[PDB]
Amino acid sequence: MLTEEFVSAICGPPLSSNTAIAKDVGIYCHTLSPSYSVKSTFKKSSVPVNCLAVSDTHIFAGQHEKAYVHVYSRLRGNQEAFVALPERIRCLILIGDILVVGTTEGRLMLWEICTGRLVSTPARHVQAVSCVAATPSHVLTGSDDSDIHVWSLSQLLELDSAAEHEPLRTLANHRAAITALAVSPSDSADTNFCVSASKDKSCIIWNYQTGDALRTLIFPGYPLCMSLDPSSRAIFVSCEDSSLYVAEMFGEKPLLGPGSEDPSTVVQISTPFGATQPDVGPASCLSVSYDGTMLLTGHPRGQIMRWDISENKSPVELANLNAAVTNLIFVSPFLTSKPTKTVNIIKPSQAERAYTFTAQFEPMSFTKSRLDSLLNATGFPADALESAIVAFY
């Protein structure tokens, strides 16, 4: 009853010669539903894992071993900008109109797309920030020093501060580099949770505002990329052993809830949802569709493979991009309403200026009148017509 689309990104040299694929393309746009096709491509891009962000108007891409961000316009269909940042980028995401960027130096910056501010935190992490997740209220950064720092967006973003920023909390139960970070859509203090994975083959569900660790899970291989289902009921985890694992948090024995065990106890997940033949390789990117029935994985040998979660059948290969696939981002089929539109980005400048916001204002029917009720009604409303006849005579 819908059409569904997703955006792919590749990295590295082309793997096989004479496959007739374009060598210059680095970002693809596909239509997953109803039938597989390619809408458009973007040229000259090499994006590592977790360095791609997709909005309705722009695609932001972090470049491998390079501090620049390539910004492409989805509206015009070309490359918009070559943004230069102070330090090399390990990961970047997009929350609202803010690009949140972690670096090799361990710093965190927030670049506001519309205002051009570059809010740079002191290097709280000792080594490189590997994964970043965000909410409307908090920003969570996991680094190579096994510390997941939880920061407040309000303290980082606000204007008149000249003092250094500090994280609200540090979640340090992990003992190795944080590979992935996923966050529940709830922002309430009691009901929220964030799910993190590390190189020590451990995956912890936290309550990040309280700082507590709700649940601990152990996998046979260390988790590469993670995604929760749209209902926030299950976790899909890719691993180094070329397998995909599913964890039901509200299944037979709930991981979280009234029927759960003690939070100090450890749950080990050993049954693979699926496995991948090693000529395809372990999945490097993992994404879940809008309905959640069907899933997409990207592999370093070029194959994009579709998994049926409900049907539990064998995965089928969509296409071979002849390059290591690093990012798959689903785009929502329904379009949301936002009062502004970001047609163009504003590059970060350290020059002192008044605070300015740059966007296109969208028609949102904020101004309402009785004349609009006259206009939009089929015919004329009865009371307004009666007043018109009284005014006529």
């Binding site: 204007l159 009691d190 605070y355 101004t367 017509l385």
Partner: protein
């Protein structure tokens, strides 16, 4: 055989005298809205014959000299264009010329207003098809714009406006749509529209005329939407220049308003308060095109400042054709300057530093006029939040400080309290969850005031009031989007009692989902029994029963 509705329309149009047709207009409109299908058919069957006779009779009613007939034809054309579609749109051209002729002819003003609405609907519907834009909209549109501007132009040197201000509101409302749709055709008329809409942007008491609120709103909307007609893609530059000129006008009026009070405020952007003559009443304005009409008197200056703040609100209300630069820093500095000046509490008049040369009556008028300026500032903050959404997070601390200072200064005014509640809900929805302890502490009197207003309306500590409704809407937000750990136990108990006695399902549900843990580290009892007793079969408790 024809449908019954169309034959009834034909018989009633044939039999009725023309002067009684406006009284039969509701039933005729209902019947012609019923038979949309015969008119939708592309043009012998009896249905097609009756449709042809019906359209011929509409044309004869419109072209003939009868104000009742013209009114009836206006209503029938509106309904026929509503139900027919492309087949009526391809023949609406003599109807378009007829409606413009109705506007040109001296007719009752309600018929002119209905013709304006019908022509606006015609242009909006013609926007879909490019060939009909080339054939119909483009030639006929300058005549329609000239006919409207002929009506709303003020011959103020010779006489006051013969046209009522509600009709000026109607014309401004129509031109607001047409400048967005047809920018290039409406481009030559922008200089006339600005001169026509100059008096209604910020009216004062010195103007000696009462301006309806809808006229001011649509005048501001049309002058903001006139940037669409800027040549060579100059819309954004005109928008930025206009909003910055409005900010400077606010500052220059604020100087003459706050002449009586020594101001400790210093600008972040770089504005400097000019010296103001202490002798005589405050005055300002001018007859120039860039300047708003002149004012004299402190109350008139306060009205001008309030109107300029409402104009700045209308900037965020209206859309833009191209991306524009919004000076949030200048607006933030301006609102900081206006909110820093607060009236003294009773018995604390001598605490506020004032210029000794100012009379005591002017000081009294200033203390009276301050809450309205503060209310306009809070409404401006509400509009800024509504347009920006998550981009207004960096301004949250300053807007909180301004709101707390205003609501503390003007605690006895219910309208200021209501606007503060409406602003506080949006503030807490954006950035209330991560507030520090001191912000919660200064927000505490606002929570006390809102709970007191709700309990007064419920009578447990009466009829519903707008301030009561605003506080009742704010009440679930104190649980959902405020740190419960920073709240004292007395405030949490007051919130729970207010939620129970108000019988508000949302606040009781939010208190159930956000338990309070004290310093003793154990949770307070929940208020779920009250919620299930008052709303047993409601949907939220049904979700709780999952």
């Amino acid at each position: 055989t024809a449908p019954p509705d169309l034959r009834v329309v034909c018989h009633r149009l044939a039999s009725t005298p023309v002067d009684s047709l406006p009284r039969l207009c509701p039933l005729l409109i209902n019947h012609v809205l019923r038979c949309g299908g015969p008119l939708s058919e592309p043009q012998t069957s009896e249905t097609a014959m009756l449709v042809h006779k019906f359209r011929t009779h509409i044309t004869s009613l419109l072209t003939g000299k009868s104000p009742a007939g013209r009114f009836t034809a206006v209503c029938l054309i509106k309904a026929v264009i509503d139900v027919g579609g492309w087949e009526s749109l391809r023949s609406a051209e003599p109807w378009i010329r007829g409606l413009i002729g109705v506007l040109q002819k001296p007719d009752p003003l309600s018929s002119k207003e209905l013709s304006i609405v019908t022509l606006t609907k015609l242009y909006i519907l013609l926007q879909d098809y490019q060939t009909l834009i080339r054939e119909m909209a483009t030639p006929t549109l300058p005549g329609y714009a000239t006919a409207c501007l002929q009506l709303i132009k003020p011959p103020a040197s010779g006489r006051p406006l013969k046209v009522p201000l509600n009709f000026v509101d109607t014309v401004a409302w129509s031109l607001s749509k047409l400048v967005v749709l047809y920018s290039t055709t409406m481009r030559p008329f922008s200089g006339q529209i600005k001169s026509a809409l100059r008096p209604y942007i910020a009216p004062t008491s010195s103007d000696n005329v009462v301006v309806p609120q809808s006229l001011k709103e649509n005048s501001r909307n049309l002058l903001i939407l006139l940037t669409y007609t800027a040549p060579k893609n100059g819309s954004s530059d005109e928008w930025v220049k206009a909003i910055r000129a409005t900010i400077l006008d606010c500052h220059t009026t604020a100087d003459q308003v706050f002449r009586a009070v020594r101001e400790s405020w210093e600008s972040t952007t770089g504005y400097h308060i000019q010296p103001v003559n202490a002798t005589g009443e405050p005055s300002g304005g001018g007859d120039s095109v860039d300047e708003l009409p002149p004012w004299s008197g402190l109350q008139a200056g306060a009205e001008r400042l309030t109107g300029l703040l409402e104009y700045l609100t209308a900037y965020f209300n209206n859309p833009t054709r191209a991306p524009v630069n919004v000076p949030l820093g200048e607006l933030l500095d301006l609102t900081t300057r206006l909110t820093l000046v607060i009236p003294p509490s009773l018995g604390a008049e001598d605490s506020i530093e004032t210029n000794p040369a100012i009379g005591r009556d002017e000081k009294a008028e200033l203390w009276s006029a301050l809450p309205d300026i503060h209310h306009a500032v809070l409404r401006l903050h509400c509009a800024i939040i509504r347009r920006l959404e998550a981009n207004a997070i960096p301004l949250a601390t300053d807007i909180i400080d301004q709101m707390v200072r205003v609501s503390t200064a003007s605690k006895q005014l219910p309208s200021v309290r209501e606007t503060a509640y409406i602003l506080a809900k949006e503030i807490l929805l954006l950035a209330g969850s991560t507030l520090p302890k001191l912000t919660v502490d200064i927000l505490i009197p606002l929570i006390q005031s809102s709970c007191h207003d709700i309990l007064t309306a419920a009578g447990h500590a009466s009829t519903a009031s707008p301030v009561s409704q605003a506080a009742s809407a704010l009440l679930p937000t104190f649980f959902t989007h405020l740190p419960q750990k920073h709240l004292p136990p007395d405030i949490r108990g007051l919130l729970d009692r207010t939620a129970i006695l108000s019988h508000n399902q949302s606040a009781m549900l939010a208190s159930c989902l956000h338990p309070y843990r004290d310093s003793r580290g154990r949770y307070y009892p929940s208020i779920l029994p009250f919620l299930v007793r008052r709303f047993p079969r409601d949907e939220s408790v049904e979700v709780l029963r999952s």
